[PDB]
């Protein structure tokens, strides 16, 4: 759920994941990770609480 964006091994390798799949792998990771404390717009140095 850290939603690790994976690369295959060394550079040049035909394997990878995608710049597409990274998309929303990248973004949710933000959302998921961030929306915890960042809870939408702005992160709270006072922390995020969800009723």
């Amino acid at each position: 759920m850290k939603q690790n964006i994976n690369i295959g091994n060394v550079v040049d390798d035909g394997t990878g994941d995608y710049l597409r799949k990274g998309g929303i792998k990248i973004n949710e990771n933000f959302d998921e990770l961030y929306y915890e404390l960042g809870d939408g717009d702005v992160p709270y140095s006072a922390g995020a609480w969800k009723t």
Partner: protein
């Protein structure tokens, strides 16, 4: 005879601006835009830094 007359003079100037103006040449370009939102699949590799 019997008449004088009064004479004002004038001048005009005939000049080509436009013959110089033209379009020199037109060019264009071929690009591959990285939008994400794609898979690889066709081929591979190729250009490698």
């Amino acid at each position: 005879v019997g008449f004088g007359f009064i004479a004002i003079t004038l001048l005009t100037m005939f000049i080509n601006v436009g013959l110089t103006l033209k379009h020199t040449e037109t060019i264009i370009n071929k690009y591959k835009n990285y939008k994400w939102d794609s898979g690889l699949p066709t081929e591979y590799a190729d250009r490698i830094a």
